[PDB]
Design a protein around this ligand. Sequence first.
Ligand code: NA
Length: 233
Amino acid sequence: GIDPFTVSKGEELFTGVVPILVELDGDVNGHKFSVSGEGEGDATYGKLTLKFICTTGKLPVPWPTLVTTLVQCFSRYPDHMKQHDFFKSAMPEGYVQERTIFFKDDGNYKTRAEVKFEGDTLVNRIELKGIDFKEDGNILGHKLEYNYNSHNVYIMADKQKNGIKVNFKIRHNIEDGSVQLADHYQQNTPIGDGPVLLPDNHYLSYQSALSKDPNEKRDHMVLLEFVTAAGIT
Ligand code: NA
């Protein structure tokens, strides 16, 4: 376990503005790519501000399809729900997030992310594997609009893994006015062996805004996100 003179642990680590670093290696139908991200999280306000860069050249999938993969420890938990915040409770040692994302009538992503502090910086290191995609489909054919809807993310305890299980549905707008559904199944497990907060059923309410940096010539995404826990009282 951690040093019992650790200065900041659990939710204490999130009372201020925290630098964030994200690193992702991906392979979707053999199209390999990497993404790096930097920004800040201010959990008191549920606020994330990040800029992501495809470091290998052109991103072979639409940026919106990576939003859910690219640090739920920055969610704003109401005071009356603080005992349900698994994500912060696992820090600084961190947690592993695993997902399968089923794109309706297309392929799936499977992801594994390790989220932990490296000093003052909250780091998310991710591997993403996509298979079974249609080369001329909405994903590999880049037919998804550069925008994002608000969603609820449903969280319950997984006592067997000393963690949580999560599911939700993302609707990505297609350029023809239709919808590309992405069904997310998720589990998180702590990296350390200490106590964590196993929550009652609740959800996170997400808002996401995607933009471009007018001075950035690399393939990139600027993301502004607000996340608030809810559904208890
Ligand atoms: Na309860």
